[PDB]
Ligand binder design. Structure first.
Ligand SMILES: [Mg+2]
Ligand SMILES: [Mg+2]
Ligand SMILES: [Mg+2]
Ligand SMILES: [Mg+2]
Ligand SMILES: [Mg+2]
Ligand SMILES: [Mg+2]
Ligand SMILES: [Mg+2]
Ligand SMILES: [Mg+2]
Lengths: 376, 390, 390, 376
C-alpha cells in the first residue's frame, strides 16, 4: 500500500500562529512556571490578533514577543506580503473563567478528552517515515533560506511525501511534493533545479528514490504571494502535522499556546513518551497508546495499548508495564517529564515528536521496561 | 466504583462530542452559515471563511470570490440566535455582540487560467490527506463511541430547546468510554456529561435531571451495568460558558466532526470551505466509499486514505484498510474504489451533488452518520457487491 | 409657538452638552480612566490613549511609555459599569463586551535625549494652538449656554442614578438657546432635552417627568417665559442608545468639553493625554489665566490663544482678546500674562500641579466650570489686580 | 496682536482616516445618492478599522476603496511604516439605529447641534490668512513630493503659520513651522534648504517675510517614522484644520464620513456659503454666522449674524437678507447647494473651505444681496 503525510514550514500562516502562541507561553513560563495559559492567535494580511485566557504573575510584552517571533521566521518586508516591524498586534486576552488537593499530584484533570501516542521502529527517531521526512524537507528549506545558500527563498512552504509499504516494511518513496515561496528574481526552472539539489537530494535517502518516484516542485508555478497575505493562520490548525502525519490517531486537542496543565498537550507528550520507550525497549515494532480523562478526575478514565500484532511480549503484560512505570495523572505527567520550563516555542514548527532533545523523546525507561519483562 | 487492579485487561475506547453552544462549534456554524448564504446565490463561489469568537465579539475573516451579496452581520446574529445565546446573563447575546469582518478577495496567484477542456480534469487547489471510515457496529455504519457521544449532546440541545429542562444553557460536552471484546461491543465503561445551566438549579437536581432526561433515553440499558462510571457536572456549577469563558475558532473540533478518534484524520477543517476544497469534499467522498464498501458487505470496518498534490487531478495516493474484516482481497477493493468512484476534485462535486447550501447543518453534531447527507447515501452498495462477485 | 417674522432682531446663542452615556463620552472616560490608573503608579508616564466603542466592543489603542502595570480590561469594564451600561436590554453590557488593546510603545524618534539643564526649559512635544476663556456671566465665570447645557445632562444622570426616575437610560443630549441684549443675558429662547429610556414609560409621562425633575430644577424661572420653546424627546421613543446605535471615539466632543461654541478652539482633544501634551495642559492653563483675569476685575470676558512649535519651550504666540471689556489696556494684559504665568510645557505642569490621577472626572460634564480642578483656582486674581494697579 | 493656525498633509494619520471615510462616502453616493452614511475610521500601525452605520442600496468594496485611498496618499512600502497593499482592513459597519413629510424640504433635522460659517476679505478666497497659507504649505509639500521634485519626501507633514495683525490688517508673518517626513537618504541641512526653496518661498508672499520672521523646519531633526506607524489616526480629529484654523468658532461636529443629511456637515457648508456671499457682496469685511437645529425640527432654532463692527449696512438688515436669500432647512441646504454627488473625498485634506470649485464656495448670490441692500 501507499501512505502519505505532509508538513509546513515556519512561514506557513497556521504555523506562524502556533509559534506566536508558544512564544507568549515561553515568555510567561520564564517568570511564572506555574502560570495558566490558553493563548489563541489569528493572523491575516497586516495584523496579528492574540487572544485567550491567562492567569499569571508574569509581566510580558505581547507586541514585542510577536514581532520578534515573526522577525525570526523571516517576514521583515512588505515585498514578502508581511512585515514584523509594521504589522498590527492586537490583544484580546482575558482571565481564565471565574477545589485543590493536599497533594498536587492528585489534582483532577482540567478537562475531559482523549489523546494518543505512537512509535515505530521504521526510523531512527522511532517515528513514521512519511511525517519524518516531510518535516525534514521543510526544515531544510528554512535552513537553506536562512544561511544564505538559496537567498531568493521566502518563509512559506509545504511538503508532502508518499511512501510505499510492503508487509510493514518500507520499499521506497512514491511521490514528493515541495512548494516554496520565493522572490520575483528567480525563474521556475532554476527554482526546481535548486530545490532538487539543495533541499530534496540532501534529505531523502537515495535508496528510496527510484526512477518511478514522482517529484512535484512548485507544481502550479510562481509562488510569490505567501504567508498571512494569502491565507488566514490560526492556532491549532496543523494538529496532524504536529503529531504523526495521520499514521496514528488523534484525539483532537491542539498543542500550542497551552501550559502543561492542559492534558490535551501534556498527556499527548506523555503518550509519545510511553510508546517510544516501549518500542525502544524492543517490546514491539509499533505501538499506539490511548489515554482519556474526565474533568475533575486524576486517574485516566481509560488506557489502551495497541501493538498491531508486533508485540514481543503478551499485550496483557504491556498494559501492566505502562501502569507500573509511568505516572499518567495530569500533574504526574508534568513532574514525570519536567514540563514547567520555557521549551515550547521550539516545538511549534517541524513537529512536536521526533527531535530527541525534548523530554518526552528520552528513552530513559527502555532498559527498565526490558528488564521488567523477559529480560534481554 | 471499580477498584484499581480489578480488570486492567479490558480493551477500552473513548470518544467525545460537544454541543452547538460550545465556542469552537459556534465558530464552525457561523463559517458554514456564511458559506450557505453565498452558495444560495452563487453555486460556483470560492469561500474560505474563518471565524473567531470571544466574549462580546465575532470576527469573520478569510477569502471569498463570489458574485453573491450577503449580510455578514445578519447571518452571524441569526446563527447565534438559533444556538440560544440571546441574553447577557448567559455570557453572550446575539443581538448586541460585535461583528467584525476581515474578508479578502483571494490571491492573484490563485489563478483562474490554466483551464481544462474537461472541467472534471481540473487539478486540486491544495495538497493534503483525508480519511474516511465506516464500521457495521451501528445501523448508520459509524463507530459507537462517537455516535452516542454525538447523541448525548444533541439530546441536551433537544431538551433545552423544547422546554423540558429550561434551565439548561447551550455550552455542553459529553464523553463515552466503550469496552470492546474481540471487535464487538460489550458495554459502556464510563459516561461524562457536563452541561451549562442557570442559577435556578442545584447540582443534585441537575444530576438527577441529566440522568433521566438525557443519559437514559440515549444509551441502551443493555450496555449499562453497575460498573459504569457516570460523571455528570463533575466539578459542580457550570454557569459561565460559551464564548464568555473560552475562545472559539473554526476548525478546532475536527475529531468531533469526523469519527471521535476511532479513525485517523488528515488534519483539514471542514467548516467555511466551499466544495472545491478537497479538505472537505474528499473527506466526504472518503466516507462515501467506506460506507458503501461496508454496506455492500465487502468488509466489517473500512478506512480510506486519499491525498492530493496542488495542480493535480488524480489523488496522489489511495489506501484501503479493512483490519482483517474484508470479504474479498484488499488489493481488489482498491481497484474497485479507483473505478467506481470519481475522486478527482470536480468529479467529487458532481458525484455527491455538492453545490448547494447544505453545510450549516453539518457544523454541529457530526458531518457523518446522518443519512440525508449526500455522502451518506448507500446507492453504490449493490453495484460494488456485484462487481466484486458476491 | 412664536410665529415667523415676530422678532428676528434678537441676538441668540446656542450651546449643547451630552451625558456620560453618550458613546463619544464613554470613549473619553475610558481613555482618561486608563490615564488615571497609570498616573497613580507612574506620575512621569507618557500616555496617548485613543478609544473606539461600538456595539459589543471597546478598542483601546494608542501609545504608552510607563513603568506602571495596569489592567486595561478591568479599567474599561469598571468605567462602563459606573456609567450604567450593565445589561443587554440597554444595548450594551460592561460585563460581557469585548475589550481589545492596540497599545504601542511610542516611536524611537520621540527621543528621551536632547535634555535640558533646567527641566522647565524642555520643548513642546508637538505644535498646535489652544484657547482659554472666561466671562463674568456666571458665578463660575463660564458662558451661560454651555454651563446650563452641562447642568441639564448632569441632572439627568443625577436623577437616573439615585432612583428618582429609574426608567432613564444613560445616553442623553441637551441644547440651550440664550437670548442676549447688549452683552447681558435676557432669557432662554429654546431648550432641547433628549433622553434614552426603557420600555416602561410612554412619551407623555416622559415629557412631564423631564420638565419637573430635570428642566425646572436647573433653569432659573426668571429666564423662562411663554416664548421659550421646549423640545423634550422631539422624535418620540429613545430606547436604543449608547454604543448600540452609534460609534464613540475619544476626542469627538471637544466643543462640549470646553465652552460650547462661545469661545474658539484649537482642535486638540483632551482625554487619554498625559499632562505633557500641550493640547490638554496649555488649554487648562489658558482657562487658568482667562479666569484669573476676569476674577481680578481686569475684564468682563477674556479669550486667550497660545500656540507652540515642537522642540520649543516658549509659546510661539500669545493673544488676549477682551472684546472691549478690559479695564486696563489690552497690551498691558498681554505682558502680565507672559510674566505671571509659566506657559512653558513643563512649567504648566508645576504651576497647575498636574501629575496626579484627576482626569477621569474631567471626561464628562465639562473640563471647565468645576472649581475643585487646579486650573479653576483663582489664586492669582489679587496679584494680577495689584500688578495692573487697581 | 498675533494669531496662529496649523494644517496637516494628506499623510497625517488623522487625515488618512478622514480621507478613507469620505472615499467610502463617495463610492456609495456614486450608486445611491440618497444613501445614509456615518463612517468612522481608525488607523494605527498595520491596520485600518472602518466602522459606523450605513443605509444604502449601493454595493461597494470597503477593502479596495481603502487600499486605493492609501495608495493615492503614498504609503506603499514598509520602509515608510505603512503599506496600502499589505495592511489589514477590518469592517465594523452596521445599520443605522432601528416620520416623513409630503415635502422632503420640510424634513426635520436628523440631530440637534450648532454650526458656524465665516468669511473675511483679507485673502482672495475670502478666508483667514493663517489657515489659508498653512493649508498651501502642506499642499505644496505633497505636490512637490508627488511630481518628483523632492522624491525623498514622505507623506506625513505638519505646518503652522503665525500672522501679525494691526487694526485688523495683516502686517506680516511672524513664525512658520514646517515638519515633514522623509527617507533616510537626506541630511537635515539639505532638507531645510530644499524645504525653504521649493515649499516655503513659492507659497508665502515675500512682502510678509521680513528678517524678523522665524522659520522652524523639522525643528527636532530626523522625521523618518510617520503616518499610522507613530500615531493613531481617527476620523473627525482635525475639525479646526478642516474649517478656519481657530479664527472662527466651531460647533463641534466632524465632517468626514457623513452624508449631506447630517446637518453637522451640510449646515456648516451652508454657513460658509452665507458668510462668503455676504463678504463678497461688500456688505461686511468679516462675517460669522451661527445656526442651530433641534432634532425633528426643520427651521433652524437660531440664526445669528456677527460682523465685528465691519458691516456696511445695518446688522438688522443683514439678518433679513440671510433669511430672504438662503434656505437653511436640512434638506433645503442639500437642494440649495446640490450636495448629492460624490465630491467629498477631495474635501478631506487641505481644508473644506477656501477652494472655489466646491459648491459652498460659489458667490452666485453676492450681486443679488448687493442689489437687495443699498445697491451698488
Ligand atoms: Mg490553514
Ligand atoms: Mg479538548
Ligand atoms: Mg477549544
Ligand atoms: Mg489543509
Ligand atoms: Mg459622534
Ligand atoms: Mg494636536
Ligand atoms: Mg491626532
Ligand atoms: Mg453633533
Amino acid at each position: 500500500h501507499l501512505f502519505t503525510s505532509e508538513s509546513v514550514s515556519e512561514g506557513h500562516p497556521d504555523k506562524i500562529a502556533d509559534q506566536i502562541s508558544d512564544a507568549v507561553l515561553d515568555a510567561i513560563l520564564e517568570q511564572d512556571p506555574k502560570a495558566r495559559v490558553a493563548c489563541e492567535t489569528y493572523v491575516k494580511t497586516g495584523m496579528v490578533l492574540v487572544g485567550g485566557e491567562i492567569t499569571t504573575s508574569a509581566w510580558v510584552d505581547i507586541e514585542e514577543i510577536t514581532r520578534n517571533t515573526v522577525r525570526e521566521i523571516g517576514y521583515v518586508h512588505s515585498d514578502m506580503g508581511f512585515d514584523a516591524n509594521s504589522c498590527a498586534v492586537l490583544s484580546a486576552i482575558g482571565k481564565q473563567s471565574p477545589v485543590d488537593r493536599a497533594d498536587p499530584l492528585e489534582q483532577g484533570a482540567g478537562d475531559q478528552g482523549l489523546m494518543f501516542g505512537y512509535a515505530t521502529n521504521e526510523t531512527d527517531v522511532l517515528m513514521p517515515a512519511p511525517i519524518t521526512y516531510a518535516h525534514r524537507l521543510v526544515q531544510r528549506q528554512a535552513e537553506v533560506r536562512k544561511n544564505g545558500t538559496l537567498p531568493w527563498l521566502r518563509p512559506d512552504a509545504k511538503s508532502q511525501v508518499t511512501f510505499q509499504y510492503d508487509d510493514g516494511k518500507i520499499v521506497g518513496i512514491d511521490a514528493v511534493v515541495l512548494s516554496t515561496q520565493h522572490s520575483e528574481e528567480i525563474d521556475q526552472k532554476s527554482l526546481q533545479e535548486a530545490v532538487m539539489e539543495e533541499i530534496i537530494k540532501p534529505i531523502l535517502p537515495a535508496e528510496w528514490l527510484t526512477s518511478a518516484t514522482k517529484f512535484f516542485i512548485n507544481p502550479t508555478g510562481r509562488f510569490v504571494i505567501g504567508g498571512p497575505m494569502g491565507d488566514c493562520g490560526l492556532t491549532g490548525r496543523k494538529i496532524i502535522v504536529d503529531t504523526y502525519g495521520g499514521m496514528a490517531r488523534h484525539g483532537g486537542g491542539a498543542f500550542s499556546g497551552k501550559d502543561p496543565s492542559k492534558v490535551d498537550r501534556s498527556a499527548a507528550y506523555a503518550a509519545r513518551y510511553v510508546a517510544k520507550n516501549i518500542v525502544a525497549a524492543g517490546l514491539a515494532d509499533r505501538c499506539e497508546i490511548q489515554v482519556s480523562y474526565a474533568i475533575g478526575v486524576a486517574e485516566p478514565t481509560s488506557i489502551m495499548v495497541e501493538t498491531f500484532g508486533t508485540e514481543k511480549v503478551p499485550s496483557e503484560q504491556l498494559t501492566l508495564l505502562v501502569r507500573e512505570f509511568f505516572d499518567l495523572r495530569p500533574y504526574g505527567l508534568i513532574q514525570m517529564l519536567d514540563l514547567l520550563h520555557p521549551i515550547y516555542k521550539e516545538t511549534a514548527a517541524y513537529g512536536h515528536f521526533g527531535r530527541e532533545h525534548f523530554p518526552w523523546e528520552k528513552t530513559d525507561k527502555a532498559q527498565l521496561l526490558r528488564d521488567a519483562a523477559g529480560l534481554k
